[PDB]
Design a protein around this ligand. Structure first.
Ligand SMILES: c1cc([C@H]2CCCNC2)c2cc[nH]c2c1
Lengths: 156, 39
C-alpha cells in the first residue's frame, strides 16, 4: 500500500456509504492515530495490511507497523497549526495560540477549535512542520465550546 | 473494515487562517482516557 509520509483519512464501509471515522499521520513507516478512532483494529492501505503495534487507552493513542515516532513538543509560547482533515473536505491549516489543560500530573497544551468527530487524529504542527500531537481528545467547557488536548506520545 | 487514504503533506502554511482562543482550564483524566473539567 501507500507508505508515503503525510496525513491520511481513516475510512470504513461498515456503515452507510463510505464514512470517515478519523485521521492519522504516516511518519518513518509508522501510522499514528487516536485509539478511539480504530479501537486498535487492523487497517488496510490498498491491498496491504497495517497491524497495531503499540496502544494505550488512557493516552488515547495507537501506532501501526512500528513504535510511536512523533516526539516534537509545543514550546508553550508560539502559535501552532491544526492540519484539519474534515470528512468530505480538503485538508486545511488553521493557526491558533494554544491554551493549557492543567492536571494533577502536569500541564498540556490545548487547542480551542471545533471540528466534526471524524476529524479526530488530525495533526497539530509547529513552525518547522513537526507534529507536536494529535487533535480529538478533549472537553466541552462552560460556553458549550470544545477544546482538544494536544495529545503526544513517547518515542521509546 | 477500515482503510486509509492520503489527504496531504504535513507542512506549515504561511498566512493560514487564524482563529480560536487560549483557555487555561483545570482538568482531570480518567482511566478510560476521558478528560473532565475540575471546578
Ligand atoms: C473531536 C473528537 C470528538 C469525539 C471524541 C470522543 C468522544 N466525543 C467525540 C468530538 C466530539 C465533538 N467534537 C469532537 C471533536
Amino acid at each position: 500500500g501507500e507508505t508515503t509520509d503525510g496525513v491520511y483519512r481513516v475510512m470504513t464501509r461498515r456503515l452507510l456509504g463510505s464514512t470517515q471515522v478519523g485521521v492519522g499521520v504516516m511518519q518513518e513507516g509508522v501510522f499514528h492515530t487516536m485509539w478511539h478512532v480504530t479501537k486498535g483494529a487492523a487497517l488496510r492501505s490498498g491491498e496491504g495490511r497495517l497491524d497495531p503495534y503499540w496502544g494505550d487507552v488512557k493516552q488515547d493513542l495507537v501506532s501501526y507497523c512500528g513504535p510511536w515516532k512523533l516526539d516534537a513538543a509545543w514550546d508553550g509560547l508560539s502559535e501552532v497549526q491544526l492540519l484539519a482533515v474534515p470528512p468530505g473536505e480538503r485538508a486545511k491549516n488553521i493557526q491558533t495560540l494554544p491554551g493549557i489543560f492543567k492536571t494533577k500530573d502536569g500541564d498540556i497544551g490545548a487547542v480551542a477549535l471545533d471540528y466534526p468527530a471524524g476529524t479526530s487524529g488530525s495533526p497539530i504542527l509547529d513552525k518547522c512542520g513537526r507534529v507536536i500531537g494529535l487533535y480529538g481528545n478533549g472537553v466541552v467547557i462552560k460556553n458549550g465550546s470544545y477544546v482538544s488536548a494536544i495529545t503526544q506520545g513517547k518515542r521509546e | 473494515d477500515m482503510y486509509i487514504e492520503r489527504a496531504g503533506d504535513i507542512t506549515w502554511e504561511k498566512d493560514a487562517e487564524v482563529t480560536g482562543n487560549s483557555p487555561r482550564l483545570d482538568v482531570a483524566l480518567d482511566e478510560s482516557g476521558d478528560f473532565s473539567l475540575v471546578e
